[PDB]
Amino acid sequence: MEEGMNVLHDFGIQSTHYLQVNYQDSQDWFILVSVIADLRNAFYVLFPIWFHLQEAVGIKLLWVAVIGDWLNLVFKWILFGQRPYWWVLDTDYYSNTSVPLIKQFPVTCETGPGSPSGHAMGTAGVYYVMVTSTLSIFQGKRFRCLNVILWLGFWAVQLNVCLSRIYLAANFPHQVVAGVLSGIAVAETFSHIHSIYNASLKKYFLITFFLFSFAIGFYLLLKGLGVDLLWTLEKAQRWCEQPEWVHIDTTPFASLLKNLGTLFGLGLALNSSMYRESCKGKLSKWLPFRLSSIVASLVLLHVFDSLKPPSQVELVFYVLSFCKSAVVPLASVSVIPYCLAQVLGQ
Ligand SMILES: O=P(O)(O)OC[C@H]1O[C@](O)(CO)[C@@H](O)[C@@H]1O
């Protein structure tokens, strides 16, 4: 368990050093890839687009994203993985040998273990869902050429995300592969479970409560036993060079709370009374209606993302993050379409 992991870590460090030294004129592109792969874009830019066209795709997209993120946190907690930016400066493995230089970027101070890659998991799951849904829509309309093109695009996206994660020295190469495989598995599993559409608010509430209870109880039980699951928060602050790069939005509680909040918000929004009256005033099948809904949702959500909850106190930050992430599904399905109905169509 010792040598088998030390060899793998050394291989990862060597690969990161190679990528950083011999491909120096690509760093901005890799940063851009690592920025547009965050799940915030899957909850703010992709759900509004896919919900107004084949709503089932949007519902499946949100369910896959949320459950994949929760499984990612659980596996991160139970697997006890390292990261290749506090390892070279800490390990004793390089005694009697030169220390390979590694360059750190402002997007390379992550608080939390990285046994499965976080960006790769979500990207693989969401984009697999998107590609499969797009293929399923167009089957009725040289379809094999379309299959080839979309699968090539999806695999190119996955490979670019993997190289971006490795290049920044944020994760090891043996973690992005696991993330991609697990994301594909989760996407397939929720592809083959058609039992989440006709769901009442009670099921959504109970599911969110069960997930929250399991996470908190597991963490508290491990702490009571003696195991600390928040060891990485100490390491991230020390081995980060500039101390202003470590944030609080990339800690393994804000992500969980935001995922639970957006799940609860979607559940409340679907069962609301305003969603029932979508097909009133003006029929929802109109192409201009769908385009206007998409445009208004995107613009208002992008402007509303400018609000940042205060982080002086952690409990206030947590509650405000929950209440803020619970609104983004509630405003694109039940409020904006109602306003469009009441404004135009008469
Ligand atoms: O890909 P990494 O190294 O896990 O980065 C963390 C990512 O995973 C997450 O923890 C999501 O679970 C986010 O904080 C972030 O998007």
Author numbering: 1 to 141, 147 to 351
Sentences from the paper on this structure:
G6PC1 catalyzes the conversion of G6P to free glucose, which is then transported to various tissues through the bloodstream, supporting essential physiological functions. G6PC1 contains a transmembrane domain (TMD) composed of nine transmembrane helices and an extracellular domain (ECD) formed by two extracellular helices and two extracellular loops. In this study, we determine the cryo-EM structures of G6PC1 in both the partially open and fully open states, in either the apo form or in complex with the substrates G6P or F6P and the product phosphate.
Recent research suggests that G6PC1 may catalyze the conversion of fructose-6-phosphate to fructose. Purified G6PC1 presented the activity to hydrolyze F6P. The cryo-EM map clearly shows the presence of F6P, confirming that it occupies the same binding pocket as G6P does. The conformation of G6PC1F6P and interactions with F6P closely resemble those observed in G6PC1G6P. Despite this, the change in the position of the epoxide oxygen atom disrupts the hydrogen bond with E110, diminishing the affinity between G6PC1 and fructose. Additionally, the smaller furan ring of F6P increases its distance from the coordinating residues, further weakening the binding.
